Amino acid sequence: NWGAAYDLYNYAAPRRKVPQFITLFADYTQPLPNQHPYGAGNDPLEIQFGAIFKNSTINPAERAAPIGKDVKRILIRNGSPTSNERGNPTGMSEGATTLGPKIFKLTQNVGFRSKGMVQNAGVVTVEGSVQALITAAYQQIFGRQLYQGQRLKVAEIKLENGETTVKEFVRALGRSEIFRKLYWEPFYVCKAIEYIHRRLLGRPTYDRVENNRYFDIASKKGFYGVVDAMLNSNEYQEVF
Amino acid sequence: SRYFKVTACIPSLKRVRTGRELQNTFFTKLVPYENWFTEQQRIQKAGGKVLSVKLFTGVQGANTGVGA
Amino acid sequence: MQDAITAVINNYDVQGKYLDGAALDKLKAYFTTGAVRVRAAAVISSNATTIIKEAAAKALIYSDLTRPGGNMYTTRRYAACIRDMDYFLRYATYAMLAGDPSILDERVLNGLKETYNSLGVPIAATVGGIQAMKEVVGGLVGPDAAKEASIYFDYLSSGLS
């Protein structure tokens, strides 16, 4: 108990409220807990738009575990249990049940089709599904709607006009200045990667290999290298 | 900052989708220069056909002013 | 898209006029045939599979299409062809219920001709299948909605051709 005991011997010992020795002696005789491959404070709170990331200085509750490199995390399927993708290699392509979240797919034409209707026709009915998809894209990428000045125009304009598809609009949102300002600037580097992974792809990271692939890109190209590498994965094209 | 005007047709053979895949199979879209490689390779590996490609944003031989 | 009511409403919107007697009798003309449209749509929905099967038997299968080298050859291509058949039938039902082919123009016909040209699908054979669907549907629904059903099938065939 070298590391645990020398934390207790320090004069910051009373500032730690989470018990450490009973947890440590229990960890020695049990399998690996499931958390981030890095420290246990590296996985953010799973709320709509928080990105909490407990500080490890405001109130130390540091918890480590030798995770290695080939340990593949166990994730719960937010939907039908038999589509976990670990016992069903093609599970994201079979149906969509009521057990999971609503899936937005811009099947409406968009395109600015026009018609054999009035030249300056007032109603035109459904162009509120493009508007419905636009406000839903923010709800996924940022977790909430932005303020008035922060909304990215001249990409929603292209999406409405049909010049670009949803995959290109999502790329414009993810590579935006506001997304970097919110979820890249004020966070530790490996925390920002883990949170951005959940926003751009619907799941947390699986492996130390998966985390390191984005880490060694962030150290060479920065935020744009991470976001571009995430959006250009085979998994994104296969699933979404 | 260059873009690409790309028209492509992607047929999905083994899936058989139940509802409205005109907008997914055949489409024209704008793509940035730095992502045209990945987008083209995505189209090729799915058996799609790249009907047309246009520059639409840049100049043919710019040494400068083409920064991302 | 639009329906009859929305078409009248926006046609008066473009002039900035309140609803007048002319829009009134167009709306009444749409309203008076509501029940027949509903009954024919219910019949078509209940007999959707049989109509497609009969149309395919009458116009497509037992030909060079189902043989090797035919566009309808192989299970994948045949299932795709019958899915297109179901597409045409369902969107014809929607257009008939709404009383306007704008939904057919927007969600069906746009780009379909060029897509079929690129894929190699036979447009003439598809039009023949659509017409077989129209004959079977006119037989099933009866005189009350036969013309109302057939007009949108003719619209689809004209747009494809």
Add this chain to the structure above:
Amino acid sequence: MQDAITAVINNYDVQGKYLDGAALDKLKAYFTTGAVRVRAAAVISSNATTIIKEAAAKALIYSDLTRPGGNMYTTRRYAACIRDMDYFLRYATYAMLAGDPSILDERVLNGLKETYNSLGVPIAATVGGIQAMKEVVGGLVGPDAAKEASIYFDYLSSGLS
């Protein structure tokens, strides 16, 4: 997008030439008018919404465009037209700062003409609005940067026309 200096650099690099007296003179000609561009750009940024309001009042509104049947009719079309207006103003300011209409060609004019043609937007009305911002901005900025501001608005109007 390129500035005057970047344009000169590219023009000399494509021929593989170092900077000579002519390129230095061109760069000096750009440098001598830098401050006036910054001042006029600051004034335009400060008075952006008033310029658009006055231009719309002088060119578009109080006509059939805002009435029923008008292209700018309805809140959605009016909002889109004014957004296009402020886009034109902002990119005109960028082009005037950079001393080069390359950004105007690259990020506004590409696709705008056929987009307007497909949507039925009045090109003559748009050109009139851009001109209205032209004399409004010329009045605001003063003699120093009036012509330099006006050349890029004329560039936008000529590209649209």
Add this chain to the structure above:
Amino acid sequence: MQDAITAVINNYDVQGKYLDGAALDKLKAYFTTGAVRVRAAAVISSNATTIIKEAAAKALIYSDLTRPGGNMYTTRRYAACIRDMDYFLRYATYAMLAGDPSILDERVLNGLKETYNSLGVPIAATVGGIQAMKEVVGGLVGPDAAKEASIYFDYLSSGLS
């Protein structure tokens, strides 16, 4: 993050107080040493890889870290250790430019210790490497910015320890 100027501005905004003589004196104290920080940052930016190479030679390599059983053994771990070293150097340069370790708190030290505990990395060896880069940078920059550079390396070492 925050620099000296932003830190003073926030400390006065939280009180809702206009800037007084003490705040002006603090800002002047930062201003009088601005140029030396820029010169030192340019020096480290120019000689980045040499600093890492000398630090590794002085403190890390030719030891049991690079032999079998060491944490720096194998090409993967060697690359990881040098990339960590580069991260420390770059953020030390940022902190020295900004005059405030808040960037080091926010983007480096937060959770680094617990990550190293999970990975098994030797914190003592990491501290030794950080100090080695410290003396190398102190030799390169000179008396003018030696202490100013050294304070942030000491801050990183104390945060890790």
Add this chain to the structure above:
Amino acid sequence: MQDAITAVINNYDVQGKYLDGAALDKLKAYFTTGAVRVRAAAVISSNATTIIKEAAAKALIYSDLTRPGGNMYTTRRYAACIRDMDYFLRYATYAMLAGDPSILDERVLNGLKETYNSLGVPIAATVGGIQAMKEVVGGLVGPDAAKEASIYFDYLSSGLS
């Protein structure tokens, strides 16, 4: 902990070297200044409460810190702040006597920034108080030991900030 002599001897032991002329000259410099540090430490020990006296009166009290909502509000927090300030003074005295910041790093600086972040203590206010006692100590000790005393207070302030 370590001081000048122990640091030098261990630095030569780790190499395996005899104490050469440079090491004896560093011990020259340390030993020639010895009595000044001793008298400065005696003065600080004799005037410790009054140094905290003027430091608090010039940096902390009569501000928003002591009013309700402040951190140093209430008798408990006031006593804790003065005990901390005395801790800083005493450990600065130890560092000045030893001629090394190792004791300050080992027994004060570690856990301090994290504890203050945990409890909400204003680090800027703490640095101001440390600078206050630095000024007071410089006034008391005089020319002989002013700089030698002030260097460790500056080290503590830089480590906290």
Add this chain to the structure above:
Amino acid sequence: SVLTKAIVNADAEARYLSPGELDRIKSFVASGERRLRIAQTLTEARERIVKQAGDQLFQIRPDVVSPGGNAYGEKMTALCLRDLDYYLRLVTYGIVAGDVTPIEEIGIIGVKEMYNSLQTPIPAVAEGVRAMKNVATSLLSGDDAAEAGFYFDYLVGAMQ
């Protein structure tokens, strides 16, 4: 309309309407005569409602008719009354159509950008719409009053 919404939902799901949409349609149709009657009543009383709503709005917001106001002057007041007439026509369209698609497209999407560019008080637009709601509800029986007040309340909420 209800037919348009049901059709678009069934198309997006890729299925037929089933008894569900079938009967909801056989009803969006039974209430047609009552909706037409309510629309006819509002159209006949269009002038009175607009004038009374303008009068009541100028009582709660006197500053709009004032030197620093959007609607200062006879012609600017006429423009405000024309706007109120436009919104009354849109409410009649919504009542006849059975939903709020025409109202939302015609005069809601971008109305904020509208009145921000024009420097117009949108809360005063909302107060005018409320005044029109009260005046219109004063001319209708209870059930039809609630039916029209639903659309007026939707307009008031969406203009926020």
Add this chain to the structure above:
Amino acid sequence: SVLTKAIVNADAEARYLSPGELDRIKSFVASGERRLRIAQTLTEARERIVKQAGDQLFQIRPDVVSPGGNAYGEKMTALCLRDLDYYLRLVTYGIVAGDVTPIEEIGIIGVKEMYNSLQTPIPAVAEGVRAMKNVATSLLSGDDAAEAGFYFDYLVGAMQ
């Protein structure tokens, strides 16, 4: 500030600072003394500037001090003057900082939402800021007047 903006831009690309950023930092540190002098000059006369800008704004837009106005009443006028003083303090902070980074987070992002919730005229607040700019530039030399006016119409453009 300038340092924060340059450092964040460099960190986004994961690279050390470019020569242009170092040059702009040198220009900023050179102009720092003048910037702090201008800030102290504005701070010394904060009450006169606020009072004169308030009287100018109320003369320009009397409707806000009208019965139906948002700033009707002694307390309401006091709150408007306090907001003007807030923006003057923000302008001084921006002048010393050399960039708009701190004032942007302090008082412009979400300002539209707060003023819409408070039902206030944003163009009226902008006119008040312009009046404050005029009163401030009346107390400064020409170059320093332009330097302060840059941040002033930055606030004016932001509140739009």
Add this chain to the structure above:
Amino acid sequence: SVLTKAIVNADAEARYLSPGELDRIKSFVASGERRLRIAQTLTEARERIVKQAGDQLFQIRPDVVSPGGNAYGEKMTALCLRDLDYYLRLVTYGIVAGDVTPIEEIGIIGVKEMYNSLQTPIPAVAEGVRAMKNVATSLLSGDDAAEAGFYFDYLVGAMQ
């Protein structure tokens, strides 16, 4: 250039230029004459700088002109001197531009791939550029020498 970097950020935020950005552009246009003088001096002393850097570089590490060296041969060394001239031209371009974007678009992006394919020593090229830095600094005043040295050691860091 500085204008390009500022305008890219302004377009990314969809906003006009910030006051810090206008101040930076003003300072850059003020420094333009000095930058032009420095570029003119380097362009005039081009060939002498290249020659001195060339015979300076082969003294620190003569192995590159050895039998197992990349630059072994008269034409091989002529190519290396041509590369040094190319980088001097790029430095002169960047000096006038005020930033490093045109230098990056021409000589830095994907520079570690072509040199890896040619199997040339990138650290050797860095020292070669450093020699050019000393030779160029020898012909300039102190301030202009530091100004050119900024771009030179920027290139040295870039090839690294």
Add this chain to the structure above:
Amino acid sequence: SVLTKAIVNADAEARYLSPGELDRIKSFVASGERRLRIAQTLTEARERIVKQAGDQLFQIRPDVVSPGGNAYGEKMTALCLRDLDYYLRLVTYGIVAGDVTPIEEIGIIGVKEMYNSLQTPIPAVAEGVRAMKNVATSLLSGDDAAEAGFYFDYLVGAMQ
């Protein structure tokens, strides 16, 4: 149910409920007594329905109750009738809830895997469900018969 579907869609869109969604909620709450009456009828006639479904099922597919059959033996037929009772219960739940959500969560998702593991004829179970549909529709009026037949048909289709 319909409320869960509408609220889920509105929440996922981050919006208040549309008037069309409110109208469908009103229709669902209006039809509540009729749906409850249909559920009461089926629940009271549950045992006869299951027995007759078993009789026509064993008549139509006698191989199922045969020596190499999944449900040969008295307890294996008891389990088959118990499964039929389970599906009738889920159909009543679906009728009361107004949609197919409870049926999908409780007895359709993974039914293919479960019945493949148990080695039971899924087409046989579908035929049994159809027999239950016939027996149930013979005990109801026409509108109620169609309303229950919709859920029975969905069950048969989903078991495919």
